[PDB]
Design a protein around this ligand. Structure first.
Ligand SMILES: C[n+]1cn([C@@H]2O[C@H](COP(=O)(O)OP(=O)(O)O)[C@@H](O)[C@H]2O)c2nc(N)[nH]c(=O)c21
Ligand SMILES: C[S@@+](CC[C@H](N)C(=O)[O-])C[C@H]1O[C@@H](n2cnc3c(N)ncnc32)[C@H](O)[C@@H]1O
Length: 260
């Protein structure tokens, strides 16, 4: 039968443009980015290069993963996850890879704390990269589509690639799951959790217009329960008034080099 997430996606696509604009941020958590954006336009100051640092911070501060050692960041974009990881005491090296080029984000070079242990490489298609051993595996790849089947096909592609890296047995991981809400995806995620561990978490900084969840090494949740709970939350926010955004301070990543 049709899943709750599938019902959500269909209703999402039916919304008027004005309905959608309000729904997408209704009741979500958001970091204030005005200060960081203006500074990145005008390398110090501790500003995060994207709102991605705050998403990974949310997971790390709650114990959903504990980065350490050599960190590989697949789909690093501007570098928000890589620069956040470099501030963590147990992390020793961060290697980010991203496609870049026209139409896509290129790595930004900033001097937040630990910048000297970060290497971001653009021009790389991770689907044509040989997997390498690492201690912490991060991946934030998954482009939204109005078609749930396209989201499924894209997520299956990401997860097939990520499995090659997980075979090296990193002790910590955080993998974006763009589409967790179809029957095929739930079965796939259950099998992956049985093989590699971890569990799925919804980060409240995600907009209501995406069903993305993060498969993280420090969770133990049931696939069906965690996905359905997220679908119910997203469906419930489609009814009634616009709920206020919960704003928090953006992450300050400090400055300076690290001794290694
Ligand atoms: C611009 N837009 C996007 N969506 C839906 O919202 C999903 C995500 O839309 P997005 O958040 O604008 O893209 P992003 O995740 O890359 O930032 C899309 O795949 C569509 O299903 C939209 N849905 C409605 N009803 N109206 C819109 O204008 C609209
Ligand atoms: C959602 S962004 C991640 C944001 C990042 N975590 C941050 O905090 O700034 C994902 C990035 O993955 C990149 N990407 C998508 N497919 C890729 C591929 N096949 N190889 C390398 N990078 C890819 C995209 O270009 C995009 O910049």
């Amino acid at each position: 039968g049709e899943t709750l997430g599938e019902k959500w996606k269909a209703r999402l696509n039916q919304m008027s443009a004005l309905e959608f604009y309000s729904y997408k941020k209704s009741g979500i958590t958001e970091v204030c980015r005005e200060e960081a954006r203006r500074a990145l336009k005008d390398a110090t100051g501790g500003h995060a290069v994207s709102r991605g640092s705050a998403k990974l911070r949310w997971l790390v501060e709650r114990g959903y993963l504990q980065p350490y050692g050599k960190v590989i960041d697949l789909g690093c974009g501007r570098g928000g996850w890589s620069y956040y990881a470099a501030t963590i005491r147990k992390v020793q090296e961060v290697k980010g890879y991203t496609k870049g080029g026209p139409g896509h984000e290129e790595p930004m070079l900033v001097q937040s704390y630990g910048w000297n242990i970060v290497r971001l490489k653009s021009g790389v298609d991770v689907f044509h990269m040989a997997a390498e051993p690492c201690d912490t595996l991060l991946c934030d790849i998954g482009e939204s589509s109005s078609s749930p089947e396209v989201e499924e096909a894209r997520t299956l592609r990401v997860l097939s690639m990520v499995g090659d890296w997980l075979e090296k047995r990193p002790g910590a991981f955080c993998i974006k799951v763009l589409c967790p809400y179809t029957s095929t995806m739930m079965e796939t995620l259950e099998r992956l959790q049985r093989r590699y561990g971890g569990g799925l978490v919804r980060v409240p900084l995600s907009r209501n217009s995406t069903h993305e969840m993060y498969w993280v090494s420090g969770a133990k949740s049931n696939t069906i329960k965690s996905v359905s709970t997220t679908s119910q939350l997203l469906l419930g926010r489609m009814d009634g008034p616009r709920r206020p955004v919960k704003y928090e301070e953006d992450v300050n990543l400090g400055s300076g080099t690290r001794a290694v």
